[PDB]
Copies of this chain bind each other. A is one copy, B any other.
Amino acid sequence: WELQKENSKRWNPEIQYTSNYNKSVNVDFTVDTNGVYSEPRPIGTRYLTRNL
């Protein structure tokens, strides 16, 4: 895959994709106690911001 790197002068921070830090019975994107792997949510793409 070829990547296009992000070059921006934006000052304030970007929005990023983050997994929640709170405690949970199961970890996201992981097998459960029965061995079944699951994907909790659709993960999109657009996060970093460009000016139009």
Taking beta carbons and an 8 Å cutoff, which residues of A are in contact with B? Answer: 11-19, 21, 27-30
Whether the pair B12, A27 counts as a contact (CB closer than 8 A) is yes
Q: Identify which of B12, B17, B27, B28 contacts A16 (C-beta below 8 A).
A: B17
A37 to chain B: closest residue by CB: B11
Task: State the main secondary structure of chain A at its contact with B.
Answer: loop
State the number of copies, please.
8
Q: Identify which of B13, B14, B29 contacts A13 (C-beta below 8 A).
A: B29
Whether the pair A29, B16 counts as a contact (CB closer than 8 A) is no
A21 to chain B: closest residue by CB: B15
Whether the pair B14, A19 counts as a contact (CB closer than 8 A) is yes
Query: Which B residues are in CB contact (< 8 Å) with A27?
Result: 12
